[PDB]
Symmetry: C2
């Protein structure tokens, strides 16, 4: 057993949990609140994704001095680029340019709506979406760009973190 063993399961369970948070959002009164408000959510979501992705890049890579700094910038770029957001768009059933814009404005609108209306469910979805974006990107990026000696370790680190996030989002969601 290795990081490939349960990779497919990450995809299915991420689909289960995110589809289930999104459907309970579509049942929330505030869901409509998502003037160019679309562009403003996109403006903010772009920056929110960037900071959160950067934080996650640092969290996992700094543990391994085998990993040069170029891989920090590389993974961040790989994680937030339109192709990756577009892949996530398709997988979750929500070209590459407008899908990414949609993903960014969806992140931004959820975070802002949670700040403005104390609607923690929308913040939960935003964090869950970004975590899946990051797992999806990392798994692909490190298979294409294996770090020296620690490729399986760091993917396993990220995969096991994402396993626990998926359970946490399932646990957090039951309260709604």
């Amino acid at each position: 057993s290795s990081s490939t063993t349960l990779h497919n399961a990450m995809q299915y369970t991420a689909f289960d949990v995110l589809s289930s948070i999104l459907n309970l959002m579509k049942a929330d009164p505030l869901y409509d609140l998502l003037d160019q408000e679309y562009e403003k959510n996109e403006f903010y979501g772009d920056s929110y994704l960037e900071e959160r992705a950067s934080s996650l890049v640092l969290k996992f890579l700094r543990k391994y001095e085998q990993i040069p700094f170029e891989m920090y910038s590389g993974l961040r770029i790989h994680t937030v680029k339109n192709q990756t957001l577009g892949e996530i768009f398709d997988l979750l059933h929500l070209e590459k340019k407008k899908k990414g814009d949609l993903v960014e404005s969806l992140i931004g609108g959820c975070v802002l709506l949670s700040q403005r209306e104390n609607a923690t469910l929308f913040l939960l979805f935003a964090h869950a979406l970004i975590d899946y974006i990051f797992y999806h990107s990392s798994y692909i990026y490190f298979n294409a760009n294996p770090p020296k000696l620690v490729k399986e370790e760091i993917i396993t680190d990220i995969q096991n973190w994402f396993k626990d996030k998926l359970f946490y989002y399932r646990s957090s969601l039951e309260k709604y």
Copy 2:
């Protein structure tokens, strides 16, 4: 008007930020700031500044329908560019005896923000988070004041500058009150 107390904004910002920075330098965790740890702080600080600046742009500009969306990216870009960060570097006298170009000053500001934020996340060193937020808030006040005087929005120029200036006044008092807790 907003022009009356602008000069005053800069002296008290210098007072409060210098005082937080000196408490930081007397902190045991200060050494853990300043392998490529510097570029990793800059890497993170760049994005942390970007999100907080975007959040502040939205907080103030959304109140005024007179303000078109172009000024959102316009103000954000103006706020995080190296020229702006270098001005804040100079105002805070962060490298008085040294020889940095605009680009290196901006780099330093980003890595200082990032290093403070990461240290507060890792060690619960709330003082370093306090400084990071105060620095970003001054960057935003400094940028907004120049940007809206250069690009006066229709009808609301004085209103929004007054809005940001009064918010920054209160933040500065908040940082003074917060830092008193560390000296005691």
